[PDB]
Amino acid sequence: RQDNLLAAIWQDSKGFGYATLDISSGRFRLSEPADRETMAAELQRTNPAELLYAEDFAEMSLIEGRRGLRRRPLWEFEIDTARQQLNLQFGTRDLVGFGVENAPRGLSAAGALLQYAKCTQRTTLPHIRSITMEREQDSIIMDAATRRNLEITQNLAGGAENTLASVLDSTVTPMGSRMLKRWLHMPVRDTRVLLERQQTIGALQDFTAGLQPVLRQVGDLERILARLALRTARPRDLARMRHAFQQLPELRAQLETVDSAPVQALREKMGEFAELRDLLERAIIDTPPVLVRDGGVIASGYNEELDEWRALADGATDYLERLEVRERERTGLDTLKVGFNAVHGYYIQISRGQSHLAPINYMRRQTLKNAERYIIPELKEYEDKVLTSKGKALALEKQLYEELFDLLLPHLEALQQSASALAELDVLVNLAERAYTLNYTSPTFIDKPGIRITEGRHPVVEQVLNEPFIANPLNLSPQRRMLIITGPNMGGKSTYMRQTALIALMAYIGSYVPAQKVEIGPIDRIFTRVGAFMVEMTETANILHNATEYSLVLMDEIGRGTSTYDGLSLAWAVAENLANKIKALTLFATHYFELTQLPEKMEGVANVHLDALEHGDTIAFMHSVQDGAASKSYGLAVAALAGVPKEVIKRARQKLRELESIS
Amino acid sequence: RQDNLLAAIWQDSKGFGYATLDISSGRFRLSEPADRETMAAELQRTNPAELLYAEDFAEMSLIEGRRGLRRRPLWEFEIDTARQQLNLQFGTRDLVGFGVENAPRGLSAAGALLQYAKCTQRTTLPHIRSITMEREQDSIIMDAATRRNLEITQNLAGGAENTLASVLDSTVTPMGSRMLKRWLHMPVRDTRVLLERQQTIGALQDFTAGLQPVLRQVGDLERILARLALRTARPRDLARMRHAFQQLPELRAQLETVDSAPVQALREKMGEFAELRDLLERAIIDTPPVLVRDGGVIASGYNEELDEWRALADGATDYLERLEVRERERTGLDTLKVGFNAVHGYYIQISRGQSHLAPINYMRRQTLKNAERYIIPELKEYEDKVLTSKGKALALEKQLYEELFDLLLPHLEALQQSASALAELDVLVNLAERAYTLNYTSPTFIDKPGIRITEGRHPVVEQVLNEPFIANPLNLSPQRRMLIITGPNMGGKSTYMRQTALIALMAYIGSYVPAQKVEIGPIDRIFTRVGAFMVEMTETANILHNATEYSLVLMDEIGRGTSTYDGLSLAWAVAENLANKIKALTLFATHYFELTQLPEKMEGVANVHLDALEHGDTIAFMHSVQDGAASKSYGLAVAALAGVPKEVIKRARQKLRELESIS
Amino acid sequence: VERPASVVKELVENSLDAGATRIDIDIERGGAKLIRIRDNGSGIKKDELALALAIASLDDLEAIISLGFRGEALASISSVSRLTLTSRTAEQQEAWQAYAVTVKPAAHPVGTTLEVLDLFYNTPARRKFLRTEKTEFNHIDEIIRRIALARFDVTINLSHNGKIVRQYRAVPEGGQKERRLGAILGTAFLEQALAIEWQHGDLTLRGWVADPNHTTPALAEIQYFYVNGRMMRDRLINHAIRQAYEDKLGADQQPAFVLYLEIDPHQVSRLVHDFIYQGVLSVLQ
Amino acid sequence: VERPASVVKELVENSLDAGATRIDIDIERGGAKLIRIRDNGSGIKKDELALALAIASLDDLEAIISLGFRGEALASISSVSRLTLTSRTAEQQEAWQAYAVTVKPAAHPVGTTLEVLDLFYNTPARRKFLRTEKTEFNHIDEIIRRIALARFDVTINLSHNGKIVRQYRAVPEGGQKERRLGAILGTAFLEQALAIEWQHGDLTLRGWVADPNHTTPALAEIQYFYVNGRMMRDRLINHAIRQAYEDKLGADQQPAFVLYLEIDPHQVSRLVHDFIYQGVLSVLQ
């Protein structure tokens, strides 16, 4: 009933930083309002009883009226002094364990808050043991590990293929390929947005054929419009742009029939611009050169004066030829050529041996090694008019090209809109094709955290594998919330886990999913931890501190302690916390066989395993998920088959025989 | 004692591939002769009794005379069919365990060999269980893991800093910075090359000051010479090149006094090229433009005709001005400007309001918005000569620039030599400064594999740490060849290992090393295994199959089996093999405490550990290497300090107490 | 066992005889390098693989080659190839595989898979004869196109050099024949398609004929006629359709059609001709 | 305890009195942000740290402040800072650290380290007085420069904002004074340096004086005179050198010198002047 809270605030040239604290409870928080308006909203939201601010704070309009205003020195809002004091209080060397390491504007505010707090209280403050971020966009949250590990766009070591992007990037235009990639790094939780895209995908599944080919011809319109604004655009950029407008009437016709409110919306957004289309059909040649510099861009029939000066220049090609033939056959000197040199001008070249036979009507203009070049009156007067006419035509061609920018820029706003609309279609047309071709099903959403899969598949792995992928079901709810997985390596453990995370991501971007049936609840954050120790302990805590009832947590083979069982001791406590306190949707893979005791100890946890079969002369991984814990050790079998020398393996199995004679 | 062997050979457009096999012994090999000559050398070396070749083999001169010539079909030398049949024989799905995965030209040859062999023998061939590469470059070998893990040039995640390169890149010119980086990826085993560089480093340690500043002014000469050969070179490339030649006489003077045979060698190799220097001082302006295309590159006084046509054009600026002043003050119209337009030509502009006051003389050439532009007889005749003179001067400026290439290309060989010499100086001058400033010592070499370090330091880690790095000694020999290391995480295990590998690398490029004293034997290959399982077992075998007595092997925390001790079972057998058969210089880090039994079981193996200290219950890592195995598990202590909530930690230690009440 | 196209066809119909509804064909480089057919039809037991490829195992087990004429066809391929095959029967069986005289177990769903490295492995000649890569793929694709139209009810997936080319989705009873028809024949045919359904008792004619008024010779590539599963060619049928085309419009430009006839056992009768001509010409007007 | 330069000097000489031969000084942003002095001299025991900054030390854990007047100086810094200190003595000790009343252990070699976050932490005024980052660094560097020349035998490392600025290598007995002299004074001074060695019994003059004929006022920044380790200023000395400079060349342009005078503990005296003048003028000619 009573917020009686404390807060701190600060500004740099980027935005505004915020932190809140209560001493009656110990709750310690951080956030970063991006703009002036959101910062205002967050103040009254929290309604603190006291408010610390730096003497430098410029936007006094936000805080002047607030109760408990307290001016403080600047050096207190020092980031490193802040970082330093905070690490002491929690008893750590890093704030990675809290997942607020990259929030410096807020941390500067929390730094002065703690320094103030130290001095104000001097009462029991061990109940201030933590700090979490108040994440403004509780849509979906992903850390660096999740962004690289799922392989959305960056494969493990930086390459491009074997990603989720590499599967679904069957988009025709580059602006659509880029747009697709943005959608995967940003799924959102609004049901409206999701149902729009699903419904669109379904109504377009039939029209896939006619649509894709047309969109490719558009080209990279998004980036051509940039050069237009900059006034850098080249002849060939406007040609693809021209051809892109020739597609619009046809796309209008194709999308007309598609019965769907979302589709008809994007149909309008597309645009028409028949005015711009006509201009360019008359203004530019069908296939123009790379640069404007050398001419041959602006068409005949477009401008009066352009064609006039070109007619003078175009009276060149045929005259040079007649001059060459006239003079060659009058004299009877076959090595007579008509050519040009930038420095000297036009000339009549004769070889060295025939140079003595020239009528010397011919004046010597230029002497070579094995040829003498000459000039006569008829060529020299003609020289002046041809080159200078080209120049006036070429100079005018550059005048008129600068003019073409002035004409097109007026529709620039609407072209940006046409570019975003066409790119979105390419994405949704593409996803409809993948859903049909790859045999995907639409997912459904529920009110509480929970997942129900029927014969779910791994969308990346299933494609590379030119053999059967063993699909597997899944059933999670707030009551059945943790699954402990034991068994062989390459057994399909991490696979069975990772397929579920991708399925969830795909659901929350609005696409169809690789399974028979998919039911799923809300998911606020996705967290990820992958094996190897400086590394491990540090980041296990990030997930524990932040995760919620609605979150998804994905543990891969933790517990590489400094001994045998000190590492097991950790994993047990870890699991009990996630299952008992946080009650999140958890999937716990581990090789430590002893953790399979939990279900009898802990309600709401259950055992599963990747069963594998040892027979004949070899091992066959069934990749088939079964209830109950794994049977045994499979590691020695694994080692051999990957490609270990047989000599070594004998010594290993011998040693294993020794270990199992202890008990 | 004579060779009675079998072999196979093949060629593509890249080079020639080779493989050898014996059925009396089972020895199976592969290599890839890079050039036609080395291929010849390798044939007589092996002197096979029979030789398979593809019907397509073009270089018959190598093999015509050889005994046992056998023509075979092409499809047999298919790479994938080859790969397929080979995986069957060894019983695997990959040849990564043998480290010949990226030798396809040889594997195509071994493919037809095995298919021939299968059919020819049909006798016991389980004794053919392996294949290793005959590595032409037995200088030093490094795989992908070693190249990224040491952080030579690429830090873990692709960034540039915290690398060995980042320490030593205090080089002044880019061609030297690039050269440094080549040297790190390619150390060689010739003692002469090593002693050259060490001696050079010592004699230059005093002259560091005067030398570095001069080398910077050279600029990136290496890549400017490329554009010279291509004929792309721009005006400003030749300007920095000109300035680079102005450095040569100075460098000659500085290096004269430096008494060292290697230094005086590089002093000569530098060159002089006073001829080229003079040309460019006269030929190009002090500060030329980015491109040749718009002129202002070639100097006045360089060419007769250039200055002549420029004199006609330079008669423009003063005439345009007199015309403007004459006409402005004759009329009394102050808004009279003289300007130019590409399309219409020169003009005399008067504002709209004053246009009615212009004299009858002025013909209207162009009408604007708020101004009328005019032309008179005096400007129009003058217009022709000025623009066309510029053009002939500009056209000639391009003639002469193309000329400058023809004149310089003759010494291109010698310039390549000068460029390589200057780049090598920058490298050696740089390493002398680092060796002095960072307090490094020169290493000494021995005949047998063995390493003896005195207070060795980690050269990268010591610098970013603004506190003490704990230096540690090391002693390895053919008799003391393995060290088993247990203890805490972040204890300094991987560190104590990794510092040793870098030390070896630095020794085998010819540089000084971070320690008191360094003695070291020959080292042929460096191998690297870092934790995390498809991954782990696959590559543990690569190292086992290839490694030798002279090699350095670096094992980090292996044995993540599918259970508790199946993973330990592996590590035991692994260790016994490296120490007992291969007898390599090995460093084995492992968390499994039970492996510390080996020294008493195994001759030539010894226990060490990173001791750490617990008071109350918070921890100081001494990072100090001591004889004997570690004391205990330290993992729970590790977890807490990285940043785990204390609440969880209590539950963990409780559970640890439960595990140790089992016995 | 002459072209690669023929080896594809027989193994496709082997799976069809086993009640297969999903036949996934993966092929690489004309079929030389790779031919992989995976079928979901009735599988094969562990004892039954051994002998189909071992050849002296039926000297008195005697009874099991009885199971198929497909089983008779496998042997002719496998002795003269690097054949690999995996199969799992009924349910709760393990999968089993064989190499070419050696067998062992594996892991598979209930069905069959058949992998082949360029058939001829001991014949130097008969492989060195084998024609192009691209052109053989076109023959294979034609063969599958012909099986495809006959059996609208079986899903067939054709991929070349890894990447998929044809995904022929099956048509359910009470379903869309256009989805499949356009995928096979391209958009082109689908545009001018006029359906035909004629019946006088036992004679039943189903199919499609293109509108001659807008038909070009680019549509006319398509001329298929099937009878109770398979296409035979006889000159009788050839005239029936062209008479109808030439009499509809005097301009006799090439006709486009795909038609299926269904009847009682007689290999051929005169009525056969007249029945067809009547059906076609009516639809046009 | 007024400028940051002064806090540096005292903690430097604290380490000197403990027999330190390597003093590494790391400073950041004028010294405000960071001041770290790490010394390899004699360290400090666990009970001896506690009370130097927790005054019932010399009663309850007693007669131990006796150990240093450095221990008297630490207290004046630590109460008014975010001080941090770690030290390890003699042998097989652990390292120990404190904040200023809270202490605990750590890991270090036999020596001492002293870390400071911007001295004044409770004083709003005396910090708001502290003025520039760059300019304060210049005062510190001057202070260290003066300690450097007095003690040629101690290696001193000065780094600013992470990156190192000065690395003063010590001079061994029977060694090169030039390595260090050029590093301190730049190559500039080293070029025109003429050594001076005068002695009349107890009076001993050692050092260097620049050749006036090529000396510019850019060399003249350097004017230091020490007496038995420390520089005092008295006007007597000022004249002795300038008389010799003005009499050598009538153009009285600014002199460049670094000189050390060495005597018995008795402050007195007229001979002091004449001794010096004689020594300088002779070297010049």
Ligand SMILES: Nc1ncnc2c1ncn2[C@@H]1O[C@H](COP(=O)(O)OP(=O)(O)NP(=O)(O)O)[C@@H](O)[C@H]1O
């Ligand atoms: N000799 C040393 N002196 C000072 N600091 C060190 C030293 N060695 C390592 N460190 C620090 O300790 C960290 C990691 O040590 P490391 O050698 O990787 O531990 P480990 O015992 O190999 N086991 P793990 O780190 O868990 O794989 C680094 O981040 C360093 O900052």
Ligand SMILES: Nc1ncnc2c1ncn2[C@@H]1O[C@H](COP(=O)(O)OP(=O)(O)NP(=O)(O)O)[C@@H](O)[C@H]1O
């Ligand atoms: N359901 C499945 N069907 C077919 N192949 C699979 C399946 N699951 C996994 N694989 C294959 O198994 C390989 C590696 O297995 P993986 O799941 O990484 O093992 P793991 O048990 O997680 N151990 P680790 O990789 O060390 O964490 C992959 O590259 C796949 O090619």
